[PDB]
């Protein structure tokens, strides 16, 4: 404590001018620049390096003192210096100061509204920041401990508008967050999931451009993997579109369609007793006698999920005595 | 069917758990109201509804401005053991906010029977909910008094108040009887005959003070009645009318059953039980009717005057709560039996200038006793009670002239006229150890502007407000994390570090110096009460003028300087600390036995007086009085007090009652006392005649004496400065005398263990040293060897140590300068 | 354990102060004093079902397509020849459907009326119900659209010439407590006509003092409630897919048409049981609970109460939903109308205006999912 | 945006329009300001998430207008007028 208190005080006077205390009697954040300008002239612009170095220790060196109060400094120090690094590092430092149970899962006034405020601020800077590389990971580093606070409809409404964003990775992780929340507060999640599922299923067949088809198909993949509650009753409409998508427009659309089909089969499982008789011929048609040497990894993996999930294992050789002929010469 | 109801129940559960920090409507309340109609989820929906109702008065208002009252009325008729505790909890919650508009909806279809049968056929908490619901039903509702008053209910109430563990029902049962005794001479006669009065009289002596205040409230209601000769007829009429109406209904049902149709396993079979149920109601009606005519208002008055004298010995009670309830009860007695007060005040104050002898004079004197209460509000409350008497005898129509004539003596035929008024109420009437003991060191010199003579009593509203703080969930400052919780952990860490560093620096005092001065302060007076705070850095001083001052020595600042409020001529004799581990409270004990407890003593603006009483009563203000000598023992909460009385009393704090009295078996005064802070059974007192005695609380008070010795071999009585037992270390019993002789003794053995060689002898709590007060300050080892000596630049007043750090405080006689010395290496 | 620090010591026996009571700092004591209804119930006991439908002939003011919207209260006018369904089947089905909202109200209908008939058809109801509400449901399709001077039209004995009736004379015929349900092609005209006639009666009764002999007290005309189909001069839809009386269907049978218009507007129409009006048969009764149809009605009641409570201000919510069951059910159905009807270029209107957040409230998605969940069970059965 | 709700696509719309607003054109500025203000009318009190970056870009490019200034500083103190 003779040295760690000193380094915390140096970090203090670098950030804003006071001393770190927990509860004995504090100030706001306006005199930071006035406290820090005299600091370097006391020993001997950009000033990014000093703040970056001072932030690089809060994520590294552990302190046994109370550690959930100077977040009220750090989060207000988000856009203090404009950068693609300062904002990102400050946001991830605030995110890594709340990992599993510090002020997170304890329930009381001034133990809950502080968490609500910091999570709201993090989501606001997560969906507001223009530079489109902060939000590829500031949403991703949201651990499963903030679920009871961000599962409320007030935050959820602002959250699911991130399902339509610029970079496709944002959609890929946001739909996974939605699928995870699909068992926390399902009353305000599941109908919205139905709405976006219907929207994607309409676009997947009424759109006519391969990259849009790609994005819709793999968004459906990650949604059907990340949420099993909205999965089973919609198997017929979700198969009636994907099943006639083994065309020759491109290899990637067919590979992703087969990936959708395999994921749907492994998610559902054992109710395809009245789909398998039609499902097997169409998949073996694209499994054998390819027109072009395309990527058959998806064509293997779709059967890899579906046969095992169905349990129709010894039968297919007897009903379709050709699959031996495919397997002997595909090698 | 869909899972919508289950999904919305889960959503409401999450809103109750994690989103309740904002007190705005939950948006899922109509769904949980709608699911209250089908036997698939009523238990779960009702328990979530009760959990929502727990939060506060905003929840019940939102649930009542949406229409849950018809639902909770309708579930009463459906019988199930599982719904019974949930219904009684929900109803106890709902009737504690707006009982005015929800008491007439419980009489429609015998809806009171639910609570009556959950009380009398299930934990004591559930029974407490039931009795609170019944009390709220009975409050100011004479129609419901008829429906609720049953002998089986009052007998079960007496059984519960005789033996039920949790004090909440021990409160609410007494409250229920007090409310049932409101204005009902039939009820008063029935309760007197069944002996609930005896049980409620025996329940005056009980550990917790809330039930004692409740008992005084019930005996406030037990005044017989002013409009009695009309209320008895006013009840006779509707008993006659109810008898006639139920009789007519009985023959109407008989004519209906005389329909010349058997109707086997049908309405007739559903009607015979109603037939003798109606017959039972009729027979109850003439039971009460037969009890009516033997009313005997005279025996009612006799029992009231027998209850008053047993109320009287609670004058030396514990709290100001019971004292305020006592003064409002006395004000109501003044209101009812005015003329006795009017005829006794003339005689009493003319004798003060210069018939009485009754138990009434005892109450008249007890009012003056309460007029000198140590609390703030009680003083002006008793003054406003006596102000009616003053205003009345100011004139008394024709008597104002005589009153003025005998009023001119205050600064320095009528006999028959005063005597005639005694018989005027003696006729209307149609052991006695008054004992009149009172330290008359003060005299009565003769915010609302007017005065309503029967005073109000907000105790019922206070008890009702308990049912709004949470019960299924722990309250603020005890949650697993909050502002006060973080403050408590910070305080705990500071106590841990000071305790550890004291053990680390224990040995430094043996070979260090003590001649260096830290800081000096000017108290503007000569201080004799001198106490460092045990852990936090503060210094409390008190002087002759009862002017108590607080110093922060680290910054050299004066925090506060106030007055104790004691009357002139008395002096504060002791200062101590309460609850030192979390937040200390200043205890000031003055030579008049007035014990006060203070809060926020370090700030002039926000200081408060929490509690104030008189632990000791019978002391006589001798010129050589040692005053109030008190010692604290935190683990048992004991406060040992003594003085000019020949008995050391123990005062408890959890019950605020006198546990036991131990005689001193001598005639001299007491100079010191000490006790073991951890074992809490052995206390040693040092007496001014040089006698050192050890007592025990484990045996009877007559043989509580264990052992007695004399300090020194001299036969003359040597004054003893202080006797102390150290809290830590080896706990050496060190006793000092004014001849310079200091001794180390043993409780088990007889001969002293060590001895060597005067204003006061002080011992640091953990440092093995002994400090002797002379013209030169000398600090010695407990083994006898001297360690240091210096001068405090006459005679010293008193020394004290900081209980853990090596701070010693010094001040001289006829000096207003107090110095602090610090031990170092 | 710590002593001298309990509730008794920190409160001294006083209750919570009243001067601090209303300065709610932690927002902990927010009061609602007027929580309990005053038991003053204005029941509805009588209804008039005005059905101006002379099937076969069209008004000369609105052009029509050769296939047009012609089904009325789920009975088709081509399966019955001339007059076995002109009133005596449509009105029978309409009365049977109105029985579901309140079974303790008696009904008596109109046989394509005339003025000498709506003498009695109104004044008998007024003289048999003193201060209780009388419902009035006007449906008009063989009638010229109402005029800006405040007239509706009825027929004569020979069914020849459309004869006018003034809303002033109609409100003198009836009395104060109303629920009016309009189904014409522009009902905002008669709604504002009734509004300005009401204020004209107010002005004439107060200032001019020439109080016209009205069967009901003057100031009690304000309780008269109105619900109207079209918000302006915008025509209804003659499309042959939907029934011609969609507003009355909304206000009368919510579950049925709400399910069928869900089938209309579902993005998926493949893998379903099929001018192709779907044949959706749902088992059970409205009044049951364990049956699927009763479950659907129950969840509908819950969700349409929740939306109303969330959106509406509290005094209006109390005035419209807690006082009486008949008016509560009609405005419950009006909440569904305010969403379904604007999908087809027609905006409904109420006389106590409602906020427009009803049609964009997020909670309707759960009701749509509830229909999906039930209809999946129906199709797999 | 007057007719179909766009709380769903507000991020894409606003982040597309900011790249327009950054480089001065002096003619497209009024039209894009009017479009974003109209979307503010459509969205309502939820636009507080999008206030600061718009304010920063406007202060950088030095573009001000009465309707936007008045309606935003009425939004902050909660007096909304369509």
Curated annotation (Swiss-Prot), chain A:
Subcellular localization, as worded in the UniProt entry: Cell membrane; Vacuole membrane
Segments annotated as HEAT repeats: 65-103, 113-151, 153-187, 233-270, 274-312
Coiled coil: none
Domain of life: Eukaryota
Protein family per UniProt: Belongs to the PI3/PI4-kinase family.
The protein's role, per its UniProt record: Phosphatidylinositol 3-kinase homolog, component of both TORC1 and TORC2. TORC1 regulates multiple cellular processes to control cell growth in response to environmental signals. Nutrient limitation and environmental stress signals cause inactivation of TORC1. Active TORC1 positively controls ribosome biogenesis via control of rRNA, ribosomal protein and tRNA gene expression, and rRNA processing.
Self-association state and partner proteins as the record states: The target of rapamycin complex 1 (TORC1) is composed of at least KOG1, LST8, TCO89 and either TOR1 (TORC1-A) or TOR2 (TORC1-B). TORC1 binds to and is inhibited by FKBP-rapamycin. Interacts with PIB2; following activation of PIB2 by glutamine. The target of rapamycin complex 2 (TORC2) is composed of at least AVO1, AVO2, BIT61, LST8, TOR2 and TSC11. TORC2 forms a homodimer. Contrary to TORC1, TORC2 does not bind to and is not sensitive to FKBP-rapamycin. Interacts with SLM1 and SLM2.
Protein name: Serine/threonine-protein kinase TOR2
Organism: Saccharomyces cerevisiae (strain ATCC 204508 / S288c) (Baker's yeast)
Curated annotation (Swiss-Prot), chain B:
Stated name of the protein: Target of rapamycin complex 1 subunit KOG1
GO terms, biological process: cellular response to amino acid stimulus; cellular response to starvation; positive regulation of cell growth; regulation of autophagy; regulation of cell cycle; regulation of cell growth; response to nutrient; TOR signaling
Protein family according to the UniProt entry: Belongs to the WD repeat RAPTOR family.
One term of GO molecular function: ubiquitin binding
WD repeats: 522-563, 567-608, 611-661, 665-705, 715-755, 758-791, 794-825
Entry keyword annotation includes Cell membrane: yes
Chief place of localization: membrane
Subunit structure: The target of rapamycin complex 1 (TORC1) is composed of at least KOG1, LST8, TCO89 and either TOR1 (TORC1-A) or TOR2 (TORC1-B). Interacts with PIB2; following activation of PIB2 by glutamine or cysteine. TORC1 binds to and is inhibited by FKBP-rapamycin.
Region (Disordered) location: 428-446
Bilayer-crossing regions: none
Keywords recorded for this protein, A-Z: Cell membrane, Membrane, Repeat, Vacuole, WD repeat
Organism: Saccharomyces cerevisiae (strain ATCC 204508 / S288c) (Baker's yeast)
UniProt function note: Component of TORC1, which regulates multiple cellular processes to control cell growth in response to environmental signals. Nutrient limitation and environmental stress signals cause inactivation of TORC1. Active TORC1 positively controls ribosome biogenesis via control of rRNA, ribosomal protein and tRNA gene expression, and rRNA processing. TORC1 positively controls protein biosynthesis by regulation of mRNA stability, translation initiation factor activity, and high-affinity amino acid permeases that serve to provide amino acids for use by the translation machinery.
UniProt topology in membrane: Peripheral membrane protein
Residues of the full protein shown: 526 to 1551 of 1557
HEAT repeat extents: 23-61, 63-100, 191-228, 302-339
GO (cellular component) term, any one: cytoplasm
Location(s) in or outside the cell: Cell membrane; Vacuole membrane
Curated annotation (Swiss-Prot), chain D:
Location in the cell: Cell membrane; Vacuole membrane
HEAT repeat segments: 8-45
Family as reported in the entry's similarity comment: Belongs to the PI3/PI4-kinase family.
Subunit details: The target of rapamycin complex 1 (TORC1) is composed of at least KOG1, LST8, TCO89 and either TOR1 (TORC1-A) or TOR2 (TORC1-B). TORC1 binds to and is inhibited by FKBP-rapamycin. Interacts with PIB2; following activation of PIB2 by glutamine. The target of rapamycin complex 2 (TORC2) is composed of at least AVO1, AVO2, BIT61, LST8, TOR2 and TSC11. TORC2 forms a homodimer. Contrary to TORC1, TORC2 does not bind to and is not sensitive to FKBP-rapamycin. Interacts with SLM1 and SLM2.
Biological role: Phosphatidylinositol 3-kinase homolog, component of both TORC1 and TORC2. TORC1 regulates multiple cellular processes to control cell growth in response to environmental signals. Nutrient limitation and environmental stress signals cause inactivation of TORC1. Active TORC1 positively controls ribosome biogenesis via control of rRNA, ribosomal protein and tRNA gene expression, and rRNA processing.
Protein name: Serine/threonine-protein kinase TOR2
Native source organism of the sequence: Saccharomyces cerevisiae (strain ATCC 204508 / S288c) (Baker's yeast)
Gene this protein is translated from: TOR2
